[PDB]
Amino acid sequence: HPNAATSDVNVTIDTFVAKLKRRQVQGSYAIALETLQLLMRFISAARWNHVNDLIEQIRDLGNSLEKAHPTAFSCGNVIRRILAVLRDEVEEDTMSTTVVAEPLISSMFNLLQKPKTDYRQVAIQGIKDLIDEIKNIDEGIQQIAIDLIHDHEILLTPTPDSKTVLKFLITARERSNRTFTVLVTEGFPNNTKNAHEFAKKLAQHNIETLVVPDSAVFALMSRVGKVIIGTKAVFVNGGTISSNSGVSSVCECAREFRTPVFAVAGLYKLSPLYPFDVEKFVEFGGSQRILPRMDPRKRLDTVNQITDYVPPENIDIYITNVGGFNPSFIYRIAWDNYKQIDVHL
Amino acid sequence: HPNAATSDVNVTIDTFVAKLKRRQVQGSYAIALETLQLLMRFISAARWNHVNDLIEQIRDLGNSLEKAHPTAFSCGNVIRRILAVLRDEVEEDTMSTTVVAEPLISSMFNLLQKPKTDYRQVAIQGIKDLIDEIKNIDEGIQQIAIDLIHDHEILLTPTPDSKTVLKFLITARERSNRTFTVLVTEGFPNNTKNAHEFAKKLAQHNIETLVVPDSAVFALMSRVGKVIIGTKAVFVNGGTISSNSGVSSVCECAREFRTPVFAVAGLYKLSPLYPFDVEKFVEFGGSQRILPRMDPRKRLDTVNQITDYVPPENIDIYITNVGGFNPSFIYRIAWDNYKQIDVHL
């Protein structure tokens, strides 16, 4: 469905679109929040009574948003989650309206074989619940995360940008008995300032900080104990897209030297879409923040990328609010929140 | 060739044989010394008249010695070295007697194409030189040896039976600026007491000592920095015979984790003969030490071995008195000490 009725009924959709396209909005969490707000707006003002049609409309809206920005996934994910929440409720309702037990939580053969209420209030509650979840992830992570960090171990941290990862680190550091040394990679094109900020924050807390160039991975890896990465998007087979610059090579190095690889993950940040090719999913970067002047650029060709995709062969741990999960197992987790039909919208 | 010619001229051969058979002589160094002494005795007493015949006799004697005891490699090696020493002198002499171009020190095409003096004194001197070489090995290692181990690094030590390895460790430990943690694997049926002794020595030296059982190698492997072998005999392609029990598995583990594997022995232990079979050269221990009783132990056939063979693929470094060498290079060193025809006797 095109944006014809969705302009005067709900106002800020255009603004959201603008934020998405021109990168006015910063941080995936913020984007998610915005999406939630939009959904709430859609719910409160508009009236439907018919449910399947409404669901379809919602799906269409999600799809359009996805098509608008092919590298922002959180927005999509949240919508999908909401749809899933709706669907189960709808299914429950149908059974009451009309008036079989499964071996597990979900059946396989049921797809091939033929199978006024306070619903609005429930829907409203759902959004609030989602918001709450988004707010408090660290409270669920803390009692699972601070179990594996030991004394006299050096920790390498690629991609330092997220407010969650920092918080996690700080919680660990609060326990002064647990001794750890932090190696921080700069990240040439985009991460630099952020990395510096992170370092400053660490200093403020009184944690031992070491500033690392992007080339110095092989020389330190023999001394590196555990590697923790702050990812933006989590996928089906295990692989992740991390928040810009120098992740793949580092992972490869880790694999070579046999190093345990931790990752800060989220259930709303987790995506049920599969990454088949490196050519499509990887977002490339600007040459503006590399070399000034454009007359030498006539013959020379600068190659640079923002967000980097990782193969599932390297990472081993995914610390969430529920717990730590294997990359060769995270699909199950996704399925416990998302459906196979709601993948291709 | 029997012992009919040598009965009143040389008698000590029998004694040597006795020492070999019932293991009255202990430590390869001692065996080597004995061999040297025997050679000296042979030289001072016997008559020659001819040189080729004498050489042949020497070869025969060597063969006999080998037949008497195969696990004594040092004995063989020393003899071979002596032969090599003789040979060059003989070659030199021939050139004067008769009265040539070469790209390097030795040529391959010289084998394909058709080619009284005071040599006794030279031969005597050779023995002395060999003795001198045997005397000090550690002094020619320590200048290279105390450059590899660094601060806050962890060492893992299989085979503490060798007298050289301990000395090497001690020399490293002497330095006030250098600090390292030592993990010691026991070796149950052959190395236990020796291992304990080593541990005690380490304690005395005032270093951080960690006594580790043979099962607890895997758990500590994430922290292991270097691997050192207490080998007894070196060979052609790189493969080495180690001084009894608990070496192979550890080496394999190291290879798996890509941990650097060092080896310290010497060039008198180095043999120009190939270890084609593990079963032929490796000797087995005793069944009595493992489990008591005899009548139920007829049913319980126990397998236990003294010496251990490690493939050249795992080991990368062979630091000797001359300098640092590789398994891909050590063959040339052997050639520089033992000649082409002297390999087969």
XYZ file of C-alpha atoms in Angstrom:
690
model
C 0.000 0.000 0.000
C 1.301 3.494 -0.957
C 1.440 6.588 1.289
C -1.905 8.223 0.420
C -4.023 7.895 3.588
C -0.931 7.634 5.830
C -0.016 11.352 5.765
C -2.784 13.336 7.518
C -3.867 10.600 9.983
C -0.250 10.116 11.134
C 2.160 13.029 10.627
C 5.736 12.040 11.547
C 6.130 9.162 9.058
C 7.731 11.522 6.527
C 10.105 12.817 9.199
C 11.049 9.239 10.110
C 11.710 8.481 6.434
C 13.921 11.577 6.198
C 15.836 10.486 9.299
C 16.366 7.043 7.760
C 17.480 8.196 4.289
C 19.687 11.233 5.091
C 21.021 9.738 8.392
C 19.544 12.314 10.801
C 18.804 9.590 13.391
C 21.784 8.076 15.282
C 21.946 4.682 17.039
C 19.896 1.544 16.328
C 18.170 1.725 19.731
C 16.908 5.210 18.910
C 15.618 3.996 15.528
C 13.813 1.128 17.268
C 12.244 3.561 19.736
C 11.090 5.781 16.872
C 9.538 2.788 15.122
C 7.731 1.818 18.317
C 6.401 5.362 18.651
C 5.181 5.272 15.052
C 3.432 1.967 15.674
C 1.754 3.408 18.772
C 0.587 6.410 16.743
C -0.817 4.085 14.071
C -2.679 2.123 16.739
C -4.153 4.992 18.828
C -5.540 7.364 16.152
C -6.717 4.956 13.411
C -9.661 2.535 13.729
C -9.885 -0.849 11.972
C -12.195 -3.447 13.643
C -11.082 -6.017 11.013
C -7.837 -7.721 12.040
C -6.320 -9.675 9.101
C -6.482 -6.635 6.829
C -4.849 -4.517 9.540
C -2.087 -7.112 9.913
C -1.535 -7.075 6.143
C -1.328 -3.273 6.177
C 1.223 -3.413 9.003
C 3.283 -5.951 7.029
C 3.190 -3.687 3.973
C 4.317 -0.723 6.070
C 7.209 -2.728 7.476
C 8.191 -3.895 3.998
C 8.228 -0.373 2.617
C 10.415 0.784 5.514
C 12.814 -2.090 4.874
C 12.963 -1.155 1.181
C 13.693 2.476 2.123
C 16.905 1.545 3.997
C 18.626 -1.826 3.288
C 21.195 -1.588 6.145
C 18.875 -0.621 9.034
C 17.410 -3.871 10.362
C 16.354 -3.042 13.937
C 13.294 -1.145 12.650
C 12.260 -4.194 10.638
C 12.921 -6.575 13.485
C 10.818 -4.672 16.002
C 7.897 -4.603 13.542
C 8.284 -8.342 12.942
C 8.258 -8.989 16.687
C 5.098 -6.914 17.058
C 3.462 -8.882 14.227
C 4.418 -12.148 15.921
C 2.925 -10.913 19.202
C -0.295 -9.990 17.401
C -0.533 -13.262 15.540
C -0.534 -15.600 18.520
C -3.217 -13.484 20.203
C -5.296 -13.570 17.011
C -4.937 -17.358 16.873
C -6.069 -17.628 20.501
C -9.053 -15.386 19.797
C -10.159 -17.388 16.785
C -10.497 -20.498 18.979
C -12.835 -18.679 21.377
C -14.797 -17.128 18.499
C -15.404 -20.552 16.953
C -16.637 -21.842 20.321
C -4.876 -30.340 19.169
C -1.785 -30.619 21.395
C 1.792 -30.261 20.110
C 4.777 -32.410 21.304
C 6.914 -29.241 21.640
C 6.344 -25.442 21.387
C 5.920 -25.651 17.575
C 4.980 -28.353 15.037
C 6.568 -29.055 11.627
C 3.796 -30.977 9.799
C 1.129 -28.322 10.579
C 2.396 -26.084 7.732
C 1.760 -28.730 5.030
C -1.462 -30.222 6.469
C -4.663 -28.124 6.588
C -5.327 -26.659 10.091
C -15.866 -7.199 20.611
C -12.791 -7.835 22.796
C -9.991 -5.922 24.608
C -7.520 -6.761 21.791
C -6.581 -3.097 21.310
C -5.643 -2.837 24.989
C -3.494 -5.974 24.674
C -1.773 -4.484 21.622
C -1.103 -1.258 23.546
C 0.365 -3.266 26.422
C 2.621 -5.131 23.983
C 4.299 -1.929 22.740
C 4.904 -0.816 26.335
C 6.411 -4.210 27.154
C 8.689 -3.956 24.123
C 9.783 -0.468 25.207
C 10.547 -1.785 28.698
C 12.601 -4.629 27.215
C 14.541 -2.156 25.087
C 15.222 -0.006 28.166
C 16.397 -2.857 30.433
C 18.660 -5.339 28.626
C 21.749 -4.762 30.838
C 19.830 -5.903 33.957
C 19.299 -9.294 32.260
C 22.861 -9.501 30.874
C 24.760 -8.629 34.117
C 24.197 -11.911 36.036
C 25.242 -14.083 33.051
C 28.027 -11.897 31.568
C 30.128 -11.425 34.747
C 30.851 -15.163 35.167
C 33.549 -15.758 32.518
C 35.950 -12.816 33.111
C 39.009 -13.845 35.179
C 42.111 -12.313 36.823
C 45.294 -11.526 34.812
C 43.648 -11.727 31.357
C 43.983 -9.173 28.540
C 40.759 -8.254 26.706
C 40.707 -6.988 23.101
C 37.687 -4.828 22.187
C 36.914 -4.155 18.490
C 34.037 -1.755 17.590
C 33.511 0.457 20.703
C 30.338 2.498 20.024
C 27.303 1.030 21.846
C 25.986 2.274 25.206
C 25.176 -1.335 26.246
C 28.658 -2.786 25.763
C 30.230 0.112 27.691
C 27.758 -0.420 30.528
C 28.589 -4.138 30.592
C 32.290 -3.319 30.783
C 31.725 -0.830 33.592
C 29.722 -3.320 35.631
C 32.637 -5.787 35.379
C 35.152 -3.075 36.270
C 33.187 -2.109 39.387
C 34.298 -5.480 40.813
C 37.874 -4.332 41.553
C 39.113 -7.856 42.418
C 38.578 -8.996 38.802
C 41.715 -7.807 36.972
C 41.654 -7.140 33.205
C 43.662 -5.052 30.711
C 41.791 -3.400 27.815
C 43.165 -3.112 24.267
C 41.154 -0.627 22.171
C 41.348 -0.605 18.354
C 40.977 2.849 16.765
C 39.093 2.011 13.540
C 40.419 4.290 10.769
C 37.420 5.748 8.844
C 34.552 6.143 11.361
C 35.347 4.591 14.769
C 38.289 6.903 15.712
C 36.442 9.632 17.672
C 34.125 7.044 19.228
C 37.124 4.915 20.207
C 38.770 7.945 21.802
C 35.578 8.682 23.737
C 35.460 5.070 24.939
C 39.086 5.302 26.069
C 38.319 8.514 27.960
C 35.363 6.837 29.661
C 37.574 3.905 30.664
C 40.148 6.316 32.089
C 37.404 8.066 34.075
C 36.410 4.749 35.688
C 40.128 3.884 36.288
C 40.587 0.917 33.919
C 43.930 0.188 32.183
C 43.661 1.427 28.577
C 45.878 0.622 25.574
C 45.312 2.405 22.237
C 45.875 -0.017 19.335
C 46.393 0.738 15.597
C 44.476 -1.359 13.017
C 47.640 -3.061 11.676
C 48.750 -4.306 15.127
C 46.615 -7.472 15.420
C 49.135 -10.282 14.706
C 51.750 -8.999 17.196
C 49.417 -8.865 20.233
C 47.170 -11.908 19.553
C 49.473 -14.368 21.385
C 48.980 -12.303 24.578
C 45.225 -11.656 24.038
C 43.018 -13.675 26.415
C 39.411 -12.995 25.371
C 37.873 -10.921 22.540
C 34.589 -8.989 23.025
C 32.804 -7.393 20.025
C 29.867 -4.947 20.109
C 27.687 -5.903 17.128
C 24.746 -4.047 15.527
C 23.043 -6.898 13.609
C 22.892 -10.650 14.382
C 21.890 -13.266 11.755
C 20.685 -16.885 11.254
C 23.827 -19.040 10.731
C 25.830 -17.161 13.391
C 27.529 -14.358 11.430
C 27.194 -10.717 12.508
C 27.474 -7.211 11.062
C 29.568 -5.158 13.509
C 29.559 -1.368 14.014
C 32.177 -0.361 11.383
C 35.860 -1.077 10.563
C 38.408 -3.841 11.296
C 36.437 -6.885 12.461
C 36.931 -9.567 9.812
C 40.718 -9.614 9.796
C 40.827 -9.582 13.602
C 38.403 -12.515 13.716
C 40.526 -14.424 11.221
C 43.601 -13.777 13.366
C 41.735 -15.024 16.445
C 40.710 -18.173 14.577
C 44.325 -18.757 13.545
C 45.688 -18.329 17.116
C 42.656 -20.093 18.732
C 41.087 -17.323 20.850
C 37.654 -17.245 22.624
C 35.359 -14.654 20.995
C 32.539 -13.017 22.995
C 29.730 -10.875 21.536
C 27.144 -8.538 23.085
C 23.857 -9.485 21.390
C 20.169 -8.521 21.588
C 16.947 -10.421 20.808
C 15.509 -7.319 19.085
C 18.852 -6.754 17.290
C 18.738 -10.369 16.028
C 17.478 -10.772 12.442
C 15.689 -13.813 10.891
C 16.956 -12.903 7.381
C 19.907 -14.856 5.953
C 23.091 -13.253 4.526
C 24.011 -15.263 1.402
C 26.460 -12.867 -0.303
C 29.129 -10.406 0.893
C 28.344 -8.161 -2.125
C 24.893 -6.983 -0.927
C 24.828 -6.807 2.905
C 28.136 -4.940 3.420
C 27.735 -1.139 3.414
C 30.664 0.818 1.934
C 32.295 4.029 3.210
C 33.280 7.572 2.257
C 36.624 8.617 0.764
C 36.098 12.176 2.097
C 37.667 11.286 5.479
C 40.760 9.583 3.969
C 42.517 11.918 1.494
C 41.737 15.565 0.507
C 41.967 16.915 -3.104
C 40.282 15.226 -6.090
C 42.689 15.681 -9.052
C 44.882 12.696 -7.989
C 41.618 10.697 -7.588
C 41.274 10.634 -11.422
C 43.686 7.669 -11.710
C 43.711 6.339 -8.115
C 40.783 4.304 -6.736
C 40.160 4.411 -2.964
C 38.527 1.315 -1.422
C 36.804 1.722 1.972
C 33.810 0.335 3.914
C 31.756 1.348 6.983
C 29.960 -1.742 8.400
C 31.708 -5.122 8.249
C 30.251 -8.646 8.018
C 31.790 -11.555 9.964
C 31.708 -15.302 9.075
C 30.166 -17.589 11.802
C 33.399 -19.676 11.960
C 35.081 -17.344 14.500
C 32.603 -16.143 17.182
C 31.483 -18.570 19.942
C 29.436 -16.670 22.591
C 26.355 -14.408 22.334
C 25.532 -12.864 25.734
C 21.877 -11.741 25.883
C 19.290 -10.976 28.615
C 18.249 -14.665 28.510
C 21.854 -15.979 28.457
C 24.878 -17.054 26.400
C 24.183 -18.920 23.153
C 26.134 -20.693 20.398
C 26.267 -19.212 16.821
C 25.246 -22.678 15.557
C 22.129 -22.406 17.792
C 20.938 -18.736 17.684
C 18.473 -19.584 14.884
C 16.330 -21.406 17.472
C 16.284 -18.277 19.650
C 15.174 -16.183 16.673
C 12.431 -18.684 15.875
C 11.239 -18.513 19.495
C 10.408 -14.846 18.664
C 9.964 -14.679 14.856
C 8.097 -16.660 12.164
C 9.195 -18.150 8.809
C 6.255 -16.555 6.925
C 7.141 -13.054 8.236
C 10.688 -13.185 6.746
C 9.794 -12.136 3.169
C 7.339 -9.237 3.532
C 84.366 -60.086 12.047
C 84.824 -61.783 15.473
C 86.860 -60.859 18.593
C 89.661 -63.329 17.728
C 92.126 -60.573 16.727
C 91.493 -58.466 19.864
C 92.009 -60.461 23.087
C 95.324 -59.410 24.686
C 95.767 -56.183 22.664
C 92.335 -54.822 23.706
C 90.235 -56.341 26.522
C 87.909 -53.441 27.499
C 85.447 -54.178 24.664
C 83.884 -56.979 26.728
C 83.549 -54.650 29.711
C 81.886 -52.031 27.495
C 79.458 -54.670 26.204
C 78.648 -55.685 29.788
C 78.022 -52.050 30.711
C 75.685 -51.692 27.728
C 73.669 -54.903 28.277
C 72.800 -54.812 32.012
C 72.679 -50.957 32.078
C 75.641 -50.422 34.433
C 76.482 -47.297 32.393
C 73.952 -44.420 32.622
C 73.580 -41.154 30.672
C 74.483 -40.774 26.986
C 77.392 -38.443 27.820
C 79.017 -41.153 29.935
C 78.556 -43.687 27.115
C 80.176 -41.249 24.684
C 83.102 -40.749 27.065
C 83.530 -44.522 27.365
C 83.505 -44.858 23.579
C 86.152 -42.135 23.288
C 88.310 -43.921 25.851
C 87.953 -47.185 23.931
C 88.957 -45.457 20.707
C 92.013 -43.967 22.411
C 92.979 -47.410 23.706
C 92.607 -48.863 20.203
C 94.794 -46.124 18.766
C 97.630 -46.173 21.343
C 98.064 -49.984 21.372
C 97.250 -51.627 17.993
C 99.386 -51.914 14.819
C 98.391 -50.766 11.307
C 101.024 -50.801 8.484
C 98.202 -50.022 5.998
C 95.534 -47.278 6.192
C 92.544 -48.623 4.203
C 92.729 -51.914 6.096
C 92.824 -50.021 9.399
C 89.775 -48.002 8.334
C 87.952 -51.231 7.441
C 88.835 -52.705 10.840
C 87.513 -49.578 12.567
C 84.273 -49.833 10.560
C 83.910 -53.482 11.567
C 84.447 -52.578 15.221
C 81.787 -49.871 14.958
C 79.369 -52.353 13.414
C 80.042 -54.819 16.222
C 79.403 -52.117 18.810
C 76.124 -51.225 17.099
C 75.113 -54.897 17.114
C 75.908 -55.078 20.842
C 73.662 -52.045 21.604
C 71.312 -50.116 19.231
C 69.907 -47.519 21.704
C 73.410 -46.087 22.305
C 73.517 -43.518 19.495
C 76.175 -41.244 21.021
C 78.725 -44.096 20.878
C 78.036 -44.544 17.182
C 78.103 -40.838 16.483
C 81.461 -40.267 18.114
C 82.969 -43.149 16.109
C 81.514 -41.714 12.910
C 82.969 -38.296 13.701
C 86.377 -39.846 14.319
C 86.150 -41.690 10.988
C 85.267 -38.438 9.232
C 88.246 -36.714 10.865
C 90.524 -39.536 9.696
C 89.092 -39.496 6.200
C 89.819 -35.873 5.383
C 93.423 -36.276 6.521
C 93.750 -39.437 4.423
C 92.384 -37.561 1.399
C 94.896 -34.755 1.964
C 97.725 -37.283 2.216
C 96.738 -39.024 -0.989
C 97.130 -35.718 -2.877
C 100.722 -35.349 -1.658
C 101.483 -39.026 -2.334
C 100.323 -38.679 -5.940
C 102.550 -35.613 -6.352
C 91.279 -30.371 -8.334
C 88.383 -27.880 -8.374
C 85.121 -27.587 -6.404
C 82.279 -24.977 -6.383
C 81.523 -25.552 -2.665
C 82.893 -27.533 0.342
C 81.470 -30.810 -1.066
C 80.573 -31.919 -4.611
C 78.046 -34.426 -6.003
C 79.710 -34.970 -9.418
C 82.985 -36.121 -7.777
C 81.298 -39.449 -6.910
C 80.299 -40.052 -10.566
C 83.648 -39.062 -12.139
C 86.733 -41.253 -11.561
C 89.101 -39.747 -8.919
C 103.920 -42.882 5.328
C 102.606 -39.841 7.238
C 102.027 -38.650 10.838
C 98.221 -39.061 10.724
C 98.173 -40.913 14.072
C 98.875 -37.702 15.984
C 96.075 -35.943 14.097
C 93.709 -38.807 14.943
C 94.703 -38.539 18.618
C 94.041 -34.786 18.523
C 90.611 -35.408 16.979
C 89.599 -37.491 19.997
C 90.724 -34.707 22.336
C 88.735 -32.170 20.319
C 85.655 -34.392 20.531
C 86.110 -34.706 24.306
C 86.371 -30.919 24.594
C 83.193 -30.494 22.550
C 81.385 -32.973 24.791
C 82.593 -31.105 27.902
C 80.767 -27.825 27.178
C 77.509 -27.494 25.226
C 75.520 -25.117 27.505
C 78.091 -22.303 27.081
C 77.437 -22.297 23.306
C 73.634 -22.340 23.753
C 73.044 -19.624 26.425
C 74.041 -16.730 24.095
C 71.070 -17.681 21.862
C 68.884 -19.322 24.554
C 68.363 -16.307 26.871
C 66.763 -14.177 24.112
C 63.519 -16.112 23.506
C 61.765 -16.073 26.914
C 60.127 -12.767 27.933
C 58.370 -11.160 30.934
C 54.915 -12.480 31.976
C 55.274 -15.507 29.643
C 54.444 -19.088 30.682
C 56.671 -22.096 29.902
C 55.569 -25.738 29.620
C 58.204 -28.425 30.279
C 57.908 -32.056 29.109
C 60.930 -34.362 29.762
C 63.011 -33.025 32.712
C 65.334 -36.080 32.498
C 67.997 -34.266 30.421
C 70.825 -32.517 32.289
C 71.286 -29.833 29.601
C 67.683 -28.608 29.587
C 67.703 -27.938 33.349
C 70.939 -25.978 32.989
C 69.433 -23.962 30.123
C 66.406 -23.163 32.280
C 68.641 -22.135 35.197
C 70.690 -19.799 33.043
C 67.479 -18.065 31.892
C 66.201 -17.867 35.478
C 69.416 -16.254 36.708
C 68.554 -12.902 35.035
C 66.885 -10.415 37.417
C 65.025 -8.570 34.623
C 63.346 -11.772 33.343
C 60.313 -13.369 35.039
C 58.400 -16.497 33.924
C 55.937 -19.093 35.277
C 56.871 -22.786 34.879
C 54.377 -25.621 34.296
C 55.903 -29.100 34.703
C 54.327 -32.308 33.350
C 55.092 -35.369 35.502
C 55.364 -38.483 33.297
C 54.109 -41.386 35.424
C 55.886 -44.712 34.704
C 59.393 -43.409 33.827
C 59.845 -39.694 34.658
C 58.065 -39.137 38.027
C 61.015 -39.095 40.455
C 63.125 -37.108 37.985
C 60.279 -34.628 37.521
C 59.971 -34.243 41.288
C 63.718 -33.621 41.549
C 63.487 -30.988 38.807
C 60.618 -29.289 40.638
C 62.638 -29.273 43.862
C 65.592 -27.724 42.036
C 63.332 -25.039 40.582
C 61.960 -24.284 44.049
C 65.505 -24.000 45.402
C 66.374 -21.581 42.592
C 63.463 -19.366 43.890
C 61.164 -19.464 40.819
C 57.366 -19.968 40.608
C 56.949 -23.730 40.084
C 53.704 -25.488 39.114
C 53.571 -29.298 39.355
C 50.995 -30.558 36.835
C 49.668 -34.153 36.455
C 49.629 -35.818 32.996
C 45.833 -35.362 32.684
C 45.743 -31.603 33.447
C 47.603 -30.410 30.305
C 44.439 -29.411 28.374
C 42.923 -26.942 30.895
C 46.050 -24.745 31.163
C 46.748 -24.677 27.388
C 45.047 -21.281 26.823
C 47.883 -19.643 28.830
C 50.878 -21.673 27.505
C 53.530 -19.625 25.654
C 56.430 -21.979 24.797
C 57.286 -25.726 24.688
C 60.759 -27.216 25.443
C 61.797 -30.870 24.830
C 64.361 -32.819 26.886
C 65.496 -34.950 23.925
C 68.293 -37.570 23.993
C 69.084 -38.165 20.282
C 68.773 -36.068 17.087
C 68.493 -37.482 13.524
C 68.591 -36.665 9.765
C 65.129 -35.390 8.688
C 64.390 -33.691 12.036
C 62.800 -36.441 14.171
C 64.159 -36.915 17.702
C 64.281 -39.594 20.415
C 63.306 -38.084 23.791
C 64.523 -39.032 27.288
C 61.551 -41.228 28.381
C 57.754 -40.699 28.687
C 55.186 -37.899 28.209
C 56.446 -35.928 25.203
C 54.411 -36.955 22.174
C 50.951 -36.026 23.383
C 52.166 -32.677 24.718
C 53.840 -31.944 21.365
C 50.633 -32.805 19.539
C 48.696 -30.467 21.836
C 51.205 -27.691 21.158
C 50.859 -28.246 17.414
C 47.068 -28.050 17.729
C 47.229 -24.738 19.670
C 50.098 -23.461 17.422
C 52.440 -23.118 20.427
C 56.191 -22.830 19.521
C 58.162 -26.039 20.180
C 61.878 -25.664 21.018
C 64.554 -28.382 21.300
C 67.935 -28.287 23.091
C 70.363 -31.236 22.772
C 73.735 -30.901 20.978
C 75.621 -32.145 17.897
C 77.225 -35.185 19.605
C 73.675 -36.550 20.066
C 73.013 -35.896 16.342
C 73.051 -39.053 14.186
C 73.652 -39.476 10.403
C 71.443 -42.617 10.356
C 67.719 -42.376 9.518
C 64.936 -43.405 11.948
C 62.930 -45.419 9.377
C 61.097 -47.417 12.070
C 59.816 -46.309 15.487
C 59.629 -49.974 16.617
C 63.300 -50.740 15.807
C 65.001 -47.899 17.735
C 62.573 -47.253 20.634
C 63.078 -49.625 23.593
C 60.300 -50.583 26.052
C 60.374 -50.470 29.880
C 59.101 -52.757 32.643
C 55.674 -54.158 33.546
C 56.498 -54.848 37.231
C 56.590 -51.158 38.287
C 52.976 -50.452 37.195
C 50.870 -53.083 39.025
C 51.480 -55.688 41.828
C 50.713 -59.482 41.806
C 51.627 -62.050 39.112
C 48.925 -64.750 38.721
C 46.060 -62.336 37.864
C 48.607 -60.187 35.953
C 49.078 -63.000 33.395
C 45.604 -61.944 32.189
C 46.471 -58.229 32.547
C 49.111 -57.589 29.857
C 50.451 -54.075 30.540
C 52.128 -51.894 27.884
C 54.848 -49.419 28.948
C 57.771 -47.833 27.055
C 60.968 -45.928 27.935
C 61.937 -43.695 24.964
C 59.576 -41.527 22.878
C 59.627 -40.554 19.183
C 58.259 -37.185 17.996
C 57.761 -36.348 14.245
C 59.789 -33.410 12.732
C 56.563 -31.537 11.784
C 55.866 -30.407 15.382
C 59.409 -29.250 16.284
C 60.817 -26.087 14.653
C 64.009 -25.032 16.514
C 67.260 -26.878 17.356
C 69.641 -24.577 19.276
C 73.104 -26.142 19.720
C 76.648 -24.967 20.641
C 77.252 -23.566 17.120
C 73.898 -21.728 16.855
C 70.173 -21.854 16.075
C 69.107 -24.432 13.478
C 65.985 -25.965 11.880
C 64.824 -29.582 11.189
C 65.016 -28.624 7.483
C 68.700 -27.636 7.917
C 70.206 -29.979 10.577
C 71.043 -32.638 7.960
C 73.759 -30.363 6.557
C 75.241 -29.961 10.058
C 75.477 -33.756 10.334
C 77.201 -33.912 6.945
C 79.684 -31.278 8.128
C 80.575 -33.702 10.985
C 80.123 -37.169 9.401
C 81.166 -38.095 5.833
C 79.172 -39.796 3.030
C 80.587 -43.367 3.169
C 80.741 -43.325 7.017
C 76.896 -43.491 7.237
C 76.753 -47.226 6.381
C 79.148 -49.596 8.177
